[PDB]
Amino acid sequence: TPPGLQTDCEALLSRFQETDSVRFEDFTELWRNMKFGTIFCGRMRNLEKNMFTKEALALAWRYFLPPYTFQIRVGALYLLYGLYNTQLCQPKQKIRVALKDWDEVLKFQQDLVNAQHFDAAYIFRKLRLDRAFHFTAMPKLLSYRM
Amino acid sequence: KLFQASPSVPAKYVEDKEKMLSRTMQLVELANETWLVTGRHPLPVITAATFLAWQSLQPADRLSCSLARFCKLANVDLPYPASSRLQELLAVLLRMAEQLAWLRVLRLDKRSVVKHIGDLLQHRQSLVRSAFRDLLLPPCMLKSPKRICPVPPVSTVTGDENISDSEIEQYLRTPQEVRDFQRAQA
């Protein structure tokens, strides 16, 4: 797991934990005043940046898996959304998903269908239409090296 | 069962029967002539000797094998003093190596003399002769026994017929102690 990227993600989630529940107003205010996304281009090297973004998306989606409050869930999901929609990077990556994670987000969509989270629903719909989800069995790669 | 290749024991541990038995016989004769079996159980010495023979027949493969491992592989109840008998026999073998010229230059030890055990039994007669020139007894007796059987001071002072009655009274139980014992054992 990426240490500094995990630290940044957890700090942003802690801030979302005090922001409004689900409304995108506080997300816009953050993206405006704090701009959590800073280390994306800098002056780094090809594979360094590639693995940076890869582990970023992988861990940010792995953190979507456990149950938390709506604040944390919205925060993680739309941090991922922003990081994918600002992909000024050239190679293909896609967010690393799990098999049953798709059914989990399907139940989440079925709940939004009766919940008033229209902005969240629309953003997630756009993310789905953008073909950003890549699913596997594990949120990372594993072998028997241990 | 180290004679026929069974499923459990691989072929590496399997050795020849005649040669291993002859080596064990030579080793137990060495133990009987070096005062190792006298006063001790013979079967532990037999086990130690056959184990040393099995290791000397092929030191490379089974240099790491232990006594408990060999007992487990052979399905034989490990004797308790077998380890001590092995430690003493290997010490005698180290003495024989010190007697021999090339080995005392090699400066072997209780783990590297197993490959030359065979050579030690080639001319073990003169080697054991010189080893006794320079008696095997328990470790508790070879710790520099300077005062062997100290002479106790003879004390035949008998007095006239007794000493006094103060000791009789100090042996007799007081009424307080009698009552206390009765209360305790009530």
Binding site: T28, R45, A121, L142 | -
Partner: protein
Amino acid sequence: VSGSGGCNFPEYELPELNTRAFHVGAFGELWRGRLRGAGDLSLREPAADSDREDAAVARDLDCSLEAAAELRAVCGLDKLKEVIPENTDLVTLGVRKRFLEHREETITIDRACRQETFVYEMESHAIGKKPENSADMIEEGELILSVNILYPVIFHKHKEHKPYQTMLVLGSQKLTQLRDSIRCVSDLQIGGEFSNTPDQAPEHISKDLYKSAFFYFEGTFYNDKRYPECRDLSRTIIEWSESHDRGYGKFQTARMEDFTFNDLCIKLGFPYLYCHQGDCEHVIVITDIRLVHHDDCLDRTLYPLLIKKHWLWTRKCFVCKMYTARWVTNNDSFAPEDPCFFCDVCFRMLHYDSEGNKLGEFLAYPYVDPGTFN
């Protein structure tokens, strides 16, 4: 023989090590069933635009533009931060600057990234390549499986373990294709003594002679029966496994040209066997199962390529130390060592006179260096 009864979901069994048993064909079928796909075509966009999305939302749950019109404007790039990443309270930027300083210390320009560029090019080789024939287009939802392989012992047992290549395979394709695609050095290896006839072309390489090969996944023995010269070592394997009650249950035997990756019952992260040429064994570790995507290789003819071509050091000629060795000599007096190695010119000029006569007695064999594929 039917597959092991188990749920399609790969429920975990060991923490961060591997999951339980499951099927692959049913896995992919349920994967395609639980969604519609129809997105692996790269037809997003290269005029009336509002009415189309209005009709789309009309079928969607909201049927209104109140939130969409604001969110599409919010989620833009014109309001996004080239510029030096500084002048802001951050955490990872400290590590970034420390890495930049460590780079400016010794790393010179943009290079020394051998494995990095290797991975880059091996990943780009599969980006948007179209098939030569229209009938070779990979259908949507095809299972792609990543499979690491550990054949060789010649590597760093210390460096966290990384001996050999990793491959990608398609579900609907047969396992024989993977068998033939595994690039083993033992297949190029050649046997026979050629000291008296060094100029004789080595014929009937091990690949053609020892056609025996078989996979082993969860007690299932897949033996190749495509060629009339393939033996069955699984016979002796089963004989050994059944001659004694060692706790191993009965194992099933099947053909390799009739069972595909879909029909397999595997465990992601669990080691399986691929044994050929008698003792040439590969530890197969199927790590990931994923569907096809328009960014991946859409050509079924070379979806299986390679993704981790581990670098290997070639054995240099012991005499000149300038060319890679091609012959191995044993019991050679003129050779400096016993496991010796010579190249063509050095071997010719050392072991033979001006006319080509065999100078001295020795045993020479064609040394197929492991670094022959790369």
